[PDB]
């Protein structure tokens, strides 16, 4: 399974 | 403009908008519609009187305002604010009234002194 | 009873103390009053409410608030309270009557004896 | 940090989370509640100074409150003009009488 | 902050309903949930994020809106009676590492088939037993507020023109006055303990206040008696000593004893000026 | 207790003719 | 920005022997950026059939792929792949070797 | 043994047409099981050996939308860097990541990794304690502070320490025939007289997984780090991986030397001679 | 992914530890748990969050958690249970998504009730005065043990409200009470709760009244008028007395002559 | 239980001093009747 | 402990700060900065007190608090709670004033009396 967190932008 | 008018006789209290003469008058107390013919005696309205007999201090104070038929009560151009206690027998005690219970008693009290002095000076 | 309309001033009862206040709606920092028309002073932005004293001696007038829009309208305010009312049962009469006949009593009797 | 100071129905209370040290003033009733410190009616003007510590921090630093009332419950309104028409009437009063002595002598 | 557009309403059958939700902590998530009694929360709709939805285990009914990141639309086509309930939104960021749902206060909302069955309370106080006074040395007012629908209101207690919370109890929830059949009513209760000393202060001023929301100013209303719309409706006491000295009593007393000792005051003045005119006649008349 | 001036002002009342008699008759045998 | 140059290896699946099918491999490797051509050719021209991986890379970013086709080796046919990159002037052309 | 799982996903920008390519790869060891390409019609999440193909729909449904997360992500990234560097709106740029994470024979945590990177250079990485980061020039600073602000690295750590390693052992369980496998090198060795004098002797490895091995030769002993060609390990295309080392010697010595193979599917490691 | 809180409705008395208990199953890989209270007001207030992931259990003020993965439990406890504490109690868990459902799932509901400790109990029926403004009459009972607790009558024409907590911070006093009101002629105060088991020597108040006039004039202030009217009435007082005074000596003066 | 200024020390200190004169105004009239 | 000195004269409240003889002293009032503004008429600071002109009951009761220039207001650990009823006019004075006004009054018109008569009698 691929990450399942939150999302951030550089 | 031209205020209320406030008359209170006793336990009854009467409200008069003078605005808007001839003109039929509705009236309203805290956003209540109040003088209509609902199956109260103790409330009345006529041409421009509303008569609250055996007034009772707790429920009937507040805002109270005056306008024509067929109008919004916001229309109205004018507000009453009336906090009141009454009484059925309690005579008001003002500059007027003391001095004329004062000045009476003083004028009884001198009649019936010099009518004994003259009767004292015709017996003795 | 409608903020809009220009209905701003509002009264606040019922305190620990007889006094009357009186509130204005406007969110300006700068409130005038009026009573009868005429200006009576101003508040801050920490006095929100103007006081007419105690309700023992019946406040009676017409007043109006403005902050930085033009004048509210007129609020009547009337206070019957019987400060000095005395109900005139038994008791007071009674006292009346035996102070009168005391009081006719001695002078009676004074105005006999400084007779001649 | 502030001792707080709550208005209930008609006494005036002092609240802690320790013991409250009498330091001057009203010396107050205990509740059972030893964080709890009643001064009474707040007509009877209770004037005092009290000291307690807290308990979520500060553990370690003093803290002292000064309560002052004042409700003229002896107060009196007296205008200028009316103690001045007073004390004239008595002292007219005082005149006459003693005009009637004089009078009274001869 | 999550916000709900209201917190009370009320409708007819057959109204397009609006509801809305509003959040400001830029959340990813948001989701629409019912409450039933004795049901748990139902969820409705979600959104994962900007224009994307997905349908809950109850959606028949609604439809949902998400054209903006802050915004979740909830919209009820025709109101039915079966859509009385609480409506609760919540927000949250994505996945399930320490990532909460965050719900505003909720929406309480009742369709009625007719505006015709909306009532205002009316409302009551009751003075404490005076047997309670002498027994325990305190005053328990109670506050009746009867016959309204629906069951929309709030209830405050006001001593001295100040709102009160310490001593007061009110019953948790509106109560059916009769629960047998349908169109009933509702009643609540309140409570307020004060010491004796206090209530027997004839200064003190006690008011039970209930808040009621009602009919909206864009409502028909053909009908005679008053239209329902939000209002406030009180009642009020003042403290009460039915024997011993009291204030009150002091005063007129004063006022009694004032007026008789001016009357006294006059008769005692008029003879002195008598008397001094009589002894001014003497006097001229001697020599 | 008795807080009630009442009875006060019957004191004074009572007291007041009394006080007034007594003076009147004393002053008069005196003089 | 540094651009890298792939390596190319050009193979078979099974140890070649005439006469069976077989697989055709040309393995490309530490390259940048990924844009490269890739093409298999027999007697000089291009095979249509070819396919390939999924583009990944390795730990220092260079990117790697595998081409792949059927083919049956004989003694009188020449096979070879042929890559062109961005990094490359002209295009490179290696050949299958069975020795390799 | 030990056993990893990693993911790879990278970013091309197009200036000129589309949005970019995005393609991203999921391997255990040295299997690619899993795979998506925008560029492909389906748009989906696909599977790429036997064993993941037990999964039900909810998995598919689950990764393909946590992908497209993943690649509008990349799409932000390659629009704000492009303006954190001061460049063109006319070029192509990359952007990569990769992620994963390791365990040992006892299938327990052993370390994890995350590292980012524009334009085949490092950009931004997790420290081994998978706390605090790395920043390599002056413009990752700023993402490195707002990072640290926002709580990312908490996020990953209890993603890499956590759901990756119980990814990891049910990927095991489920495809213990193939992926529990071990296969031993085939090896021979040729001999080619260059011209007439030299010649050169090569020993192959054949068909062996996994793709970690170790070729050296020997004359007598002697360690030939130098004079000696190897090249790097290659796949065959069915799973298996290739490998051969060659030396030149003078002709007529071939028995001095050996070739030496270690892998670890051999008992005991091996040793070869011409003929 | 369901979670099951199987125990409707827990009491506990003030001061005390309470554990609201809370079973989860699911096939997720990653997954959280977390606990919502929602009092009578209706709002939903976070409480407590734990991950599936993280040594030790979540613990925040007064909230802590007794997480158990092996059995699949995660108990809400409770420390030095106060009066507010009596709500709504939610468990709830969401996961990864890809190995189960994204969306959460929440608990059935555990009802909370805190009970006062009633040192001195003094079970009592009271009547409250007629209102004057409606027809009902109100009975009170009230100071009862909190042990006794009181059933619904079964007339269609009385109403009885359940027990209910009141706190007076003024004088530390906890108190229960219920109320029961009606429209007949026949209520009496007497009666109005037969139907539920209340105590022994419970008073009911004789039907006449009593005074304390001492507690009365405990509760006596003035004002700044009745002060002002006082001292009127003393000036006046001493200002008639002055006059008669030379009112009587002029007249003996005229008199002797 | 707050008079301030109505505790009634004031009404029955203006009653003592009245009796206080009275009665020794009453005892010097008998002393000097008798005398 | 020196308490604060508070004096109270019609409508105007006068406050002292204590313990600080020398430094300035700023003052804050239920959290606010009050006082050494140089404007706001009715309220005004000196060397150490604090004066409150047409003080309000509802608005100016509550806590206050006095500290040194230089510190921040939460170092100070000593704090006035004040409610006072101002009126206009209006002052405090207990019953043993009204008696002994009234026992000297009535003992000054005595002594003027007997005075007088013994003036009047020999004559
Ligand atoms: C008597 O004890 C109570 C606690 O039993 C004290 O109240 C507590 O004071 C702390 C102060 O640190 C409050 O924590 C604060 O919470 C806010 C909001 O979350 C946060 O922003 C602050 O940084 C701080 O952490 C705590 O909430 C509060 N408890 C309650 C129930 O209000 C109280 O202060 C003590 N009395 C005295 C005089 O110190
Ligand atoms: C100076 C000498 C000649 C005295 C004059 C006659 C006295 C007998 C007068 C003086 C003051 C009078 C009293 C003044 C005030 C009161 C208060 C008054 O109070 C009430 O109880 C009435 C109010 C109510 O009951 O509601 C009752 C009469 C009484 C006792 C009066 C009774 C008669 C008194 C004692
Ligand atoms: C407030 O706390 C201080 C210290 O935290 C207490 O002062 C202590 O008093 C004891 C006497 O029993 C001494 O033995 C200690 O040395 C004191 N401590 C310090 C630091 O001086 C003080 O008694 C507490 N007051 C209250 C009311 O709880
Ligand atoms: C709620 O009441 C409405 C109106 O009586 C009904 O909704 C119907 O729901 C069914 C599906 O169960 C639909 O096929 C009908 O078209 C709906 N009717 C209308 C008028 O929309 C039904 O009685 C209740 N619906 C639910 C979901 O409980
Ligand atoms: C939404 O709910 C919050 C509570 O979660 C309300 O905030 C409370 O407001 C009251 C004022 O009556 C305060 O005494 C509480 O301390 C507040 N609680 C918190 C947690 O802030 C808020 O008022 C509600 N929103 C609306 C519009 O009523
Ligand atoms: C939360 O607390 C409970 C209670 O201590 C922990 O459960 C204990 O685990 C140990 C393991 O060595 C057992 O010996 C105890 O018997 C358990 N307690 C009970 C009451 O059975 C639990 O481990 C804690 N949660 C976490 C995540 O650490
Ligand atoms: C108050 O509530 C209930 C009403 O039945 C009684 O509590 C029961 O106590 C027994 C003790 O063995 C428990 O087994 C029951 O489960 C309890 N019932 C409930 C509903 O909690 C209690 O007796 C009642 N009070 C009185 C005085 O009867
Ligand atoms: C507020 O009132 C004062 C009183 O004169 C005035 O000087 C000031 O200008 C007013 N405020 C504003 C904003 O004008
Ligand atoms: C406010 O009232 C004045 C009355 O003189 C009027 O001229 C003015 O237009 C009013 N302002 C607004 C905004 O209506
Ligand atoms: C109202 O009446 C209908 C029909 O008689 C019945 O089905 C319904 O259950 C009643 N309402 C309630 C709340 O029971
Ligand atoms: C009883 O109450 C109902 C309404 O609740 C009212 O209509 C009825 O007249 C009442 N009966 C009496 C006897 O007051
Ligand atoms: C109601 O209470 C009275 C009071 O003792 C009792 O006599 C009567 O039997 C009770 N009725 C019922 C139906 O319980």
Not at chain 5, 135 to 150: D, N, R
């Amino acid at each position: 399974g691929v990450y399942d967190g939150r999302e951030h932008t550089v | 403009q031209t205020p209320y008018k406030v008359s209170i006789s006793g336990t009854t209290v009467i409200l008069t908008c003078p605005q808007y003469p001839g003109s039929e008058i509705l009236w309203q107390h805290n956003d209540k519609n109040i003088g209509g013919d609902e199956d109260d005696k103790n409330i009345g309205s006529d041409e421009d009187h509303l008569s609250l007999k055996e007034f009772s201090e707790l429920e009937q104070s507040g805002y109270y305002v005056c306008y024509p038929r067929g109008s919004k009560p916001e229309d109205a151009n004018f507000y009453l604010y009336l906090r009141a206690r009454v009484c059925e027998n309690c005579m008001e005690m003002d500059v007027m009234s003391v001095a004329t219970i004062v000045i009476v008693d003083i004028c009884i009290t001198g009649g019936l002194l010099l009518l004994v002095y003259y009767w004292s000076k015709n017996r003795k | 009873q409608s903020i809009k309309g220009n209905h701003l001033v509002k009264v606040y009862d019922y305190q620990e103390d007889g006094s009357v206040l009186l509130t204005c709606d406007a969110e300006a920092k700068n409130i005038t009053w009026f009573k009868d028309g005429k200006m009576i002073g101003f508040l801050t932005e920490d006095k929100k409410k103007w006081n007419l004293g105690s309700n023992a001696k019946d406040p009676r007038g017409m007043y109006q608030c403005k902050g930085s829009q033009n004048k509210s309208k007129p609020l009547q305010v009337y206070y019957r309270m019987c400060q000095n009312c005395i109900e005139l049962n038994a008791a007071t009469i009674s006292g009346f009557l035996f102070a009168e006949i005391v009081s006719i009593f001695v002078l009676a009797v004074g105005v006999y004896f400084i007779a001649g | 940090f502030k001792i707080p100071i709550e208005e209930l129905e008609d006494r005036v209370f002092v609240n802690c989370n320790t013991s409250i040290t009498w330091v001057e003033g009203t010396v107050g009733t205990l509740l059972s509640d030893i964080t709890r410190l009643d001064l009474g009616k707040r007509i009877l003007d209770p004037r005092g100074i009290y000291r307690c510590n807290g308990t979520d921090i500060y553990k370690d630093k003093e803290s002292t409150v000064q309560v002052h009332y004042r409700m003229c419950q002896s107060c009196v309104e007296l205008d200028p003009a009316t103690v001045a028409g007073i004390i004239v009437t008595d002292v007219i009063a005082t005149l006459l009488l003693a005009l009637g002595v004089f009078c009274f002598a001869g | 902050k999550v916000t709900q557009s209201s917190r009370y309403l009320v409708k007819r059958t057959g109204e397009k309903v609006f509801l809305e939700c509003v959040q400001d902590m830029d959340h990813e998530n948001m989701f629409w949930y019912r409450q039933d009694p004795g049901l748990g929360l139902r969820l409705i709709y979600f959104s994962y994020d900007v224009k994307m939805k997905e349908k809950g285990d109850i959606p028949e009914g609604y439809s949902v809106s998400r054209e903006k990141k802050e915004r979740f639309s909830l919209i009820l086509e025709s109101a039915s009676t079966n859509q009385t309930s609480m409506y609760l939104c919540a927000s949250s960021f994505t996945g399930p590492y320490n990532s909460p749902l965050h719900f505003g206060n909720g929406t309480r909302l009742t369709v009625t088939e007719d505006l015709n069955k909306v009532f205002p309370p009316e409302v009551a106080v009751f003075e404490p037993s005076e047997a309670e006074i002498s027994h325990t040395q305190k005053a328990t007012l109670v506050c009746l507020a009867t016959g309204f629908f629906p069951d929309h209101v709030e209830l405050s207690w006001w001593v001295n023109g100040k709102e009160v919370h310490s001593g007061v109890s009110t019953d948790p929830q509106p109560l059916k006055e009769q629960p047998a059949l349908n169109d009933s009513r509702y009643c609540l209760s309140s409570r307020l303990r004060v010491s004796a000393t206090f209530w027997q202060n004839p200064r003190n001023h006690f008011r039970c206040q209930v808040q009621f929301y009602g009919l909206s100013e864009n409502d028909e209303w053909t009908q005679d008696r008053a239209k329902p719309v939000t209002q406030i409706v009180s009642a009020e006491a003042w403290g009460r000593a039915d024997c011993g000295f009291t204030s009150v009593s002091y005063q007129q007393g004063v006022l009694s004893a004032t007026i008789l000792y001016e009357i006294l005051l006059g008769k005692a003045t008029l003879y002195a000026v008598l008397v001094s005119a009589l002894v001014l006649m003497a006097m001229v008349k001697r020599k | 207790g008795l807080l009630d001036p009442k009875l006060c002002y019957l004191l004074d009342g009572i007291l007041f003719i009394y006080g007034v008699i007594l003076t009147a008759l004393f002053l008069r045998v005196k003089f | 920005m540094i651009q890298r140059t792939p390596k190319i290896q050009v193979y078979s699946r099974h140890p070649a022997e005439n006469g069976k099918s077989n697989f055709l491999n040309c393995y490309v490797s530490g390259f940048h950026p990924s844009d490269i051509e890739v093409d298999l050719l027999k007697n000089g021209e291009r095979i249509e059939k070819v396919e390939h991986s999924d583009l990944s890379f390795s730990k220092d970013w260079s990117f790697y792929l595998l081409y792949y086709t059927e083919f049956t080796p004989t003694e009188k046919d020449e096979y070879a792949c042929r890559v062109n990159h961005v990094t490359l002037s002209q295009p490179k052309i290696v050949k299958w070797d069975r020795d390799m | 043994g030990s056993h990893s799982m990693r993911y790879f996903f990278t970013s091309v920008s197009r200036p000129g047409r589309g949005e970019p390519r995005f393609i991203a790869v999921g391997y255990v060891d040295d299997t690619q099981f899993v795979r998506f390409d925008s560029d492909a019609a389906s748009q989906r999440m696909e599977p790429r050996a036997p064993w993941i193909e037990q999964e039900g729909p909810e998995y598919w449904d689950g990764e393909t939308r946590k992908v497209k997360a993943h690649s509008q992500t990349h799409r932000v990234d390659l629009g704000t860097l492009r303006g954190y560097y001061n460049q063109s709106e006319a070029g192509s740029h990359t952007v990569q990541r990769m992620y994963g994470c390791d365990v040992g024979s006892d299938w327990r945590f052993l370390r994890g990794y995350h590292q980012y990177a524009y334009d085949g250079k490092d950009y931004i990485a997790l420290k081994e304690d998978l706390r605090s980061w790395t920043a390599a020039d002056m413009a990752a600073q700023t993402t490195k502070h707002k990072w640290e602000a926002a709580h990312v690295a908490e996020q990953l750590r209890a993603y890499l320490e956590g759901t990756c390693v119980e990814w990891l052992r049910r990927y095991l369980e489920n495809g213990k025939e193939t992926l529990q496998r071990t296969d031993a090198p085939k090896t021979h060795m040729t001999h080619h007289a260059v011209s007439d004098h030299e010649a050169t002797l090569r020993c192959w490895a054949l068909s062996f997984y996994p793709a970690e091995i170790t070729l050296t030769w020997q004359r007598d002993g002697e360690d030939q780090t130098q004079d000696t060609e190897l090249v790097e390990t290659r796949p065959a295309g069915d799973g298996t991986f290739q490998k051969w080392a060659a030396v030149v010697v003078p002709s007529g010595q071939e028995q001095r030397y050996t070739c030496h193979v270690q892998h670890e599917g051999l008992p005991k490691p091996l040793t070869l001679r011409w003929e | 992914q369901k979670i099951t809180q199987t125990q409707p409705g827990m009491f506990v008395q003030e001061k005390e530890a309470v554990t609201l208990d809370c079973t989860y199953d699911t096939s997720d890989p990653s997954y959280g748990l977390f606990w919502y209270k929602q009092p009578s007001s209706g709002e939903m207030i976070f409480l407590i969050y734990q991950g599936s992931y993280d040594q030790q259990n979540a613990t925040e003020g007064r909230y802590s958690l007794n997480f158990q993965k092996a059995r699949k439990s995660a108990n809400l406890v409770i420390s030095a249970s106060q009066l507010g504490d009596s709500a709504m109690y939610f468990c709830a868990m969401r996961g990864g998504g890809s190995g189960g459902s994204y969306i959460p799932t929440f608990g059935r509901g555990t009802s909370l009730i805190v009970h006062p400790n009633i040192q001195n109990p003094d079970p009592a029926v009271y009547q409250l005065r007629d209102s004057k403004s409606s027809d009902k009459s109100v009975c009170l009972f009230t100071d009862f043990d909190s042990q006794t607790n009181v059933s619904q009558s079964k007339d269609s024409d009385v109403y009885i409200t359940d027990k209910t907590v009141l706190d007076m911070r003024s004088m530390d006093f906890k108190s229960n009470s219920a109320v029961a009101w009606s429209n007949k002629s026949d209520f009496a105060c007497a009666n109005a709760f037969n139907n539920s088991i209340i105590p022994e020597d419970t008073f009911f108040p004789s039907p006449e009244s009593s005074c304390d006039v001492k507690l009365v004039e405990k509760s006596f202030e003035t004002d700044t008028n009745l002060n002002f009217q006082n001292l009127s009435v003393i000036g006046f007082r001493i200002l008639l007395l002055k006059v008669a005074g030379f009112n009587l000596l002029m007249t003996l003066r005229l008199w002797s002559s």
